Amino acid sequence: TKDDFSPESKGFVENSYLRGLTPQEFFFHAMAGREGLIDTAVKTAETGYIQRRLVK
Amino acid sequence: QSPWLLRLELDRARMLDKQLTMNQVADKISEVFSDDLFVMWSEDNADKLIIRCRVIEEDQMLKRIEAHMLDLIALRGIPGISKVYMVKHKVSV
Amino acid sequence: YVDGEEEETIMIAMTPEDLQTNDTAKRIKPEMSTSSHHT
Amino acid sequence: HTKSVYDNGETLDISLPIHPKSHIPQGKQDRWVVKLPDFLDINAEPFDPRPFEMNVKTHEDKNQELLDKLIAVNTVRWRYAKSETGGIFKETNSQIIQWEDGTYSLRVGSEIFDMFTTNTDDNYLVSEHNEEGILMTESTLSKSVKLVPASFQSTTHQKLAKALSAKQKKESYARSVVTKEDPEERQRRLESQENERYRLERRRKQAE
Amino acid sequence: DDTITTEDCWTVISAFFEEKGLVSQQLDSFDEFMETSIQDLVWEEPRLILDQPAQHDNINKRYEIRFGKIYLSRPTMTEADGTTHAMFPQEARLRNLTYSSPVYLDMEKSMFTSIDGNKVHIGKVPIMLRSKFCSLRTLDEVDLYKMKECPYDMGGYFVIN
Amino acid sequence: DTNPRSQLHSVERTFDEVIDPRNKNRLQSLIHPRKKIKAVKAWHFFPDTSTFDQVFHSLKFVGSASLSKDRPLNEQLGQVNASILTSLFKPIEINPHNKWISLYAVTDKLSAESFRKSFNSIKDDNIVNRHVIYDHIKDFDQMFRGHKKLFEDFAISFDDISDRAFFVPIVGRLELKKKRIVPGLVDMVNRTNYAHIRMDLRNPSTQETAIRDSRREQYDPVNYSSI
Amino acid sequence: IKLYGREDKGTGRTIKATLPYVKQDIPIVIVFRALGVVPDGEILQHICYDENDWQMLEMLKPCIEEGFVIQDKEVALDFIGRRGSAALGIRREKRIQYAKDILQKELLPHITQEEGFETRKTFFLGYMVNRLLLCALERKDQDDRDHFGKKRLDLAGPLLANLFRILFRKLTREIYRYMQRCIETDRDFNLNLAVK
Amino acid sequence: SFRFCLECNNMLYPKEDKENQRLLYSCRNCDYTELAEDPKVYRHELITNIGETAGIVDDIGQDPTLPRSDKECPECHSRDCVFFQSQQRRKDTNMTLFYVCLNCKKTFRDE
Amino acid sequence: IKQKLETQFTCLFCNHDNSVVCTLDKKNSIGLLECKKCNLSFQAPINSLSQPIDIYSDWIDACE
Amino acid sequence: GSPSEPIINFLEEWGMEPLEDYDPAQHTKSTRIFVNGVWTGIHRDPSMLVSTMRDLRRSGAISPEVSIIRDIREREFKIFTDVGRVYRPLFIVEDDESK
Ligand SMILES: [Zn+2]
Ligand SMILES: [Zn+2]
Ligand SMILES: [Zn+2]
């Protein structure tokens, strides 16, 4: 529903991997993993450029 | 002088929180504006804290003066220091 | 059928068991107690 | 103080011919403007059963025929009714029904269409006099009236829904064909003929 | 009534996949294109106009051509010796051909003058496999095997060269 | 029901099932399909014979041209006013580019009331020569939109004594907006319109009456065809 | 429809509207008058829908002050026509006709294309300015660019339609050029040779 | 609030008479001039609360995505209501709730 | 403050191109067009939103 | 993709009033009606209209891939027949209180 600030409504996963995630928790966890992948694949080029300038 | 009047209502709570006096604000306005503007201020005990002003087609001139006053009247403090926090530092002596 | 824009105005139950109101191995479902009733 | 622009005082002695009215509004010169829906038509002409029967048109397109049938059966009509006393009276198939809540409804046969009235200000009805080039006002149009079907189960609404649903189902513009030969054969044979006549024209021009 | 189990939901999903399949969007879009979009694009600018106020007795002549109907056919293959025959996707794959069909347009010419036309081939459009205009749409399971086509193949692609 | 005989039979069935408005019992028998509310009063739906010869247009004021909004104009013309109900409109067009409408009204309340009473009581063949003078008020810019179909819009007037409802066709819609006259064209403006217009009421000529009857013969030929 | 002026900077917060085939931005009042509604009150009637909201009226006040210089429809259209990126030296009447053309067509084409139908265009302009003011007065968040219900997918159909439109226009231009060349020779062309 | 001209519908700018010492609203496109009722020429709110409760509609009870509570209505004492937070979306906006009854449809707080 | 700008307009008396200079004074609300070859001067009032195209169009209207 | 002409016909049949007959002062509570992003009219009883449109779409009278959106907060009622909209199917729960 609208204006829900409970932990389950905003991305708290109360189950374990052994117990199994619910679909909402599954989607939120996928969002977080996508964030991780984007962050790595975006910061790599900046780090490489900084390393090259330092070496030169 | 001019019939146009300029009065501004200031929040009592934040004015007391900053620990400021109405006379101080009046002296700041008087210093920055010399005698070009006549200023009066309601006392502390007033229900609503107000401070009027009077100039000595000028509606737009008064609007520009009010905008300039709101923009760049510095009451106290170091310019550029937007906010200040108190911190505790653990030091070995 | 509903598209993404029409989804903002509807209320969706996750399972048909959700339409009607202590095991260590079964997953736990949200309470959804913020509202007294759900339509 | 905006001074009046016109002060010449020139006056035209124009006289307008006016005809008596068959009816006169009582208590208020108010009229209600009603938008005509697609499913409703107005037939001011008197109903003539034999030409009506002789002019029924049949089309292959089922949707167009169904729309024509619906608008024809729903058309507002009137006809002369021979009274039992030997006189002639005007008889119509359309009536206006007012419910207890004060709302009005237009009824044709068994079909009933509700009326939604919206108040309109500074809206009047005028009569045009083209031969003199002036407009003579008639009355005031206080309310604008829209006609809405009463319910889903009404036959008019079901026929309209069926016609509009099946109208957009038929969509086929491209027509299939069978190719028996190379499609580029015409181009190459006409290019060969054009090259031949170019050579002949060049030879003739050099020989002319 | 009775309650609806998860198996009923899977029955409904099976009905969905029995009706639509997995590549229905591609085939439906291509069928919409071939059926209406080509005709609408042709009718967007249906009139080319050329005028010539000839004075060489003033005769104002307008020359204009109209575009009419679009005609499509099943894909055909034209050999070097001049013969033609129906093409199938396996032959196009093996011989590096393009699976495409000719497009015909009706051009009507008129000669306007004031003193004061059949099917033309406009090109070949590649055909999406298993669509309404593909040869494999009709073939049943046995002739599909005889045509060396896999029955598990779903279509939704083109064969260029 | 594609049979023409079936369509004709449906037409006569609809014609025969008309409920008499005086029949209170049959009126109460009728029930709203959705509201489930009984009927109170009924009125017959008939066309108008005396007005089909004339041409009717729905005239509306757009925006600030509202008479209610213009308070000094409304006060001058009276706070329904007979002056508004008897106003005159005079379309004058110097050229295709420049066009406007001239509005005239009766400032006096007594003259306007007498003219309105005389106009609304025309049922005999005696009309008094009411030389009414109309005064110019204001000018507005105009635009016109035409109706593709004849009976696109129709205004309904009621008649309680006969339990009928007369409707008239609407040819087009006229919209008016306030026009500010350019100061450089007031010299030509003063030569276009007039400060006063006198209206004289006279009996219609026989030839014009015959022409109007011939026009009405399209609708009603039983009572108006020439012999 | 840009909203110039920063908070407490740049004096007035004017609203200028960018128009197609027009070299410089235009204040909203001038184009509103050009469409054919002069009075300022009716411009505010079109833009705002609740008179008690003094803040949006205050934000529209600089636009009214800037546009007060123009007071007639025809001068507004002429002002549109000067900046219309056309050939220099065009006459005033032709400039006004060019402004009428560039205003009827190419200005919100999805609404309508016919003459005398600009009331809906004025109402839509009021709607756009209302949305701009509602976002500017912190009453609503800015639109989510990444919202998926505001996106569309182009399948084989639309892509092939765009490609075929380009190629058919090229073929039509080739037919036109060949026809122009052939009319020099004055021959009854087969018309099966122009098409490539 | 600002008034408009009654004859040409333009804005009525305030004007001051030197000889008469009066505040008058005058249209600059004509000679019309109407006497002002109040001297409040201009008012600017640095911190404002308008639009917090102004975003209310009369059909908000038909929205199925809104949560439903059992708070007591101050007017008709109904047992069903629909609540939501502030429609203003600045960073300083409070998290207080506005409750709407399903009979009288008025907006009331819990404090 | 007078503003002098070189413009690519065409003089209607000498027919030479790129010899038109626009001089507008916003303080006195005036605009002067001078031909570098013909030495003719055209004066027209200007407003707060004036641009050299406005004075050029005014000159075109005055010429015809 | 679907044509928008039957949608406009249905809307005009069920009491929608065009823009030329619209006064914002008078209509302080009417709902703006958009069709494919084009503001085409207004209405004062949006509940009956959205119920009728949804029932017609569910019966097959309107194409199933047509979008029917009612924004109660902004007082808007939007309809989309555009091409390229991604959709998914869902079960329908009987929400009629009287049932
Ligand atoms: Zn004024
Ligand atoms: Zn209550
Ligand atoms: Zn020169």
UniProtKB/TrEMBL annotation, chain B:
UniProt subcellular location: Nucleus
Entry similarity comment: Belongs to the RNA polymerase beta' chain family.
Entry function: DNA-dependent RNA polymerase catalyzes the transcription of DNA into RNA using the four ribonucleoside triphosphates as substrates.
Record-given protein name: DNA-directed RNA polymerase subunit
Protein's organism: Komagataella phaffii (strain GS115 / ATCC 20864) (Yeast)
UniProtKB/TrEMBL annotation, chain D:
Full-sequence portion shown in this chain: 75 to 282 of 429
Biased composition (Basic and acidic residues): 171-199
Species: Komagataella phaffii (strain GS115 / ATCC 20864)
Name the record gives this protein: RNA polymerase-associated protein LEO1
Domain of life assignment: Eukaryota
UniProtKB/TrEMBL annotation, chain E:
Top-rank taxon: Eukaryota
Location in or out of the cell: Nucleus
Described purpose of this protein according to its UniProt entry: DNA-dependent RNA polymerase catalyzes the transcription of DNA into RNA using the four ribonucleoside triphosphates as substrates.
Subunit-structure text: Component of the RNA polymerase II (Pol II) complex consisting of 12 subunits.
Family of this protein: Belongs to the RNA polymerase beta chain family.
Protein's recorded name: DNA-directed RNA polymerase subunit beta
Natural source organism: Komagataella phaffii (strain GS115 / ATCC 20864) (Yeast)
Classification of source organism: Eukaryota, Fungi, Dikarya, Ascomycota, Saccharomycotina
From TrEMBL, chain F:
Keyword hit for Nucleus: yes
Primary site of residence: nucleus
Source domain of life: Eukaryota
Single biological process term from Gene Ontology: transcription elongation by RNA polymerase II
A GO cellular component annotation in the UniProt record: Cdc73/Paf1 complex
Composition bias type Basic and acidic residues, residue spans: 210-219
Organism: Komagataella phaffii (strain GS115 / ATCC 20864) (Yeast)
Keywords from the named record: Nucleus
Name the UniProt record assigns to this protein: RNAP II-associated protein
GO molecular function: chromatin binding; RNA polymerase II complex binding
Similarity section: Belongs to the PAF1 family.
Location of this chain's protein in the cell: Nucleus
Region (Disordered): 205-227
